[PDB]
Structure 1
Amino acid sequence: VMDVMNRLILAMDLMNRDDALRVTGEVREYIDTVKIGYPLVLSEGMDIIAEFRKRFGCRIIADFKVADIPETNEKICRATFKAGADAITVHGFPGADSVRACLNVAEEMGREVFLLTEMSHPGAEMFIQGAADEIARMGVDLGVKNYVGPSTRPERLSRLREIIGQDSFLISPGVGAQGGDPGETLRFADAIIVGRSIYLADNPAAAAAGIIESIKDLL
């Protein structure tokens, strides 16, 4: 599995290149894994991945939540890996063919897929929560090794960990701004994803260091 420094992944959702680079640079001593999503990519271009690689010693997870038909999913994954992303996130709710399309490209291209199981926001209760255990089981059957699950629902995160097994890699957003606790989340997740609690802080480095201090015995 990827070796995530300090079990902490920065969710870099600032939408301005200068601010995104400044903040990421400020926390780089604490974090070697950065999640870049559509807020930044659609604002600054896919070349932002190249820029981050050039500036920082960071792996890049492209959080694109791929959710199209198999043929379009393949194209999205190809473009994303061509740009230099180490990994891409993929929704499971569109079904096994859509997931398989992404896995096939990732295999061919030597990169990784993260399967999104249950999401951390309130609306996830409406449809996703009821499908999530089956989505996770589907991932296991398809050979998915990397998963995303919700910090905001420890009971759900624990169940999802059970389903995927201890050998699978699990990362978890919803820590901080959405209400999730770093320590409790790391009982089940390999790494926590943190965005606003760091990138909106007056001192993002101090914010990151504070989170890390609070989980030091878990490192």
Structure 2
Amino acid sequence: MDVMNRLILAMDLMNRDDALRVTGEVREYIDTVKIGYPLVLSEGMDIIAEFRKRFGCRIIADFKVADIPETNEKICRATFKAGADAIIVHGFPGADSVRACLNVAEEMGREVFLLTEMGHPGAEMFIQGAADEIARMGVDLGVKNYVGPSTRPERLSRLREIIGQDSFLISPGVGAQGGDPGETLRFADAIIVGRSIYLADNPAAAAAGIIESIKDL
């Protein structure tokens, strides 16, 4: 996957007008947008097609898929039907639940991104201790796309070690949550940035600044 400027916009605004306007302001800096439930549940799944029509950008649905296999397949089908190019799935629920997603992605020409470890404080309670095993499960299942935490560069580095240099890795937690753009890119192929951009007084300048700090990479 070729992500422009190695920067993925996490568009979590919950108003269609603001979401479209802000994304439009930073469109020259990106070509990949991560859309999640905050926006989809507020404005509908048709918003995905609207983004493709207005920006011709890649769409990653950050839906943290975490249900039983049967339901996961239905969720992936509905998501890809709406035009998403990829979907983010939790690994904690087990291999069968991940496989269900991989099946639908293969049938509709999309990609599955396996979320192995999250970066918020609570992730240390249960997720962190299972993260390495979840990553190995991904490798065993043939997963090639992963999501790891910018807030814990040592954990992100370990994830990269497990999956190898060939796998694709994206990482949220940059900016608002404290992650550093440059350091995160030492291990991840692309960084995900939300609030530091869409809540900034001037989103375009915010995006430009981040890219400027990593222009060397």
- If the length of structure 2 is used for normalisation, what is the TM-score? 1.00
CA deviations 1:85-137 (Å, max 9, x no partner) are: 00000000000000000001101111000000100100000000000000000
Displacement of 1:183 in angstroms is 0.3
| 1:177 matched to 2:180 | no
Identity among equivalent positions (%) equals 99
Match of 1:109 in 2: 108
- CA–CA distance in structure 1, aligned partners of residues 30 and 155 of structure 2: 26
CA deviations 1:9-45 (Å, max 9, x no partner) are: 0000000000000000000000000000000000000
CA deviations 1:155-207 (Å, max 9, x no partner) are: 00000000000000000000000010000000000000000000000110000
- CA–CA distance in structure 1, aligned partners of residues 148 and 75 of structure 2: 22
- CA–CA distance in structure 1, aligned partners of residues 67 and 40 of structure 2: 18
**What pairs up with 1:155-166 in 2 under 5 angstroms?**
155-166=154-165
- CA–CA distance in structure 2, aligned partners of residues 149 and 17 of structure 1: 28
- CA–CA distance in structure 1, aligned partners of residues 110 and 174 of structure 2: 26
Displacement of 1:4 in angstroms is 0.0
CA deviations 1:31-60 (Å, max 9, x no partner) are: 000000000000000000010001002100
Question: 3-state SS of the aligned residue for 2:77?
Answer: helix
- CA–CA distance in structure 1, aligned partners of residues 78 and 164 of structure 2: 31
| 1:20 matched to 2:19 | yes
- CA–CA distance in structure 1, aligned partners of residues 109 and 165 of structure 2: 23
5+ residue gaps, structure 2: none
5+ residue gaps, structure 1: none
Question: 3-state SS of the aligned residue for 2:178?
Answer: coil
Match of 1:144 in 2: 143
- CA–CA distance in structure 2, aligned partners of residues 57 and 75 of structure 1: 26
- CA–CA distance in structure 1, aligned partners of residues 96 and 73 of structure 2: 11
Displacement of 1:5 in angstroms is 0.1
Question: 3-state SS of the aligned residue for 1:28?
Answer: helix
CA RMSD of aligned residues (A): 0.4
- CA–CA distance in structure 1, aligned partners of residues 158 and 201 of structure 2: 36
- CA–CA distance in structure 2, aligned partners of residues 57 and 41 of structure 1: 18
Structure 1 runs (4+) deviating above 3 angstroms are: none
Displacement of 1:213 in angstroms is 0.2
Count of matched residue positions in the alignment of Structure 1 and Structure 2: 217
- CA–CA distance in structure 1, aligned partners of residues 49 and 3 of structure 2: 20
- CA–CA distance in structure 1, aligned partners of residues 178 and 200 of structure 2: 16
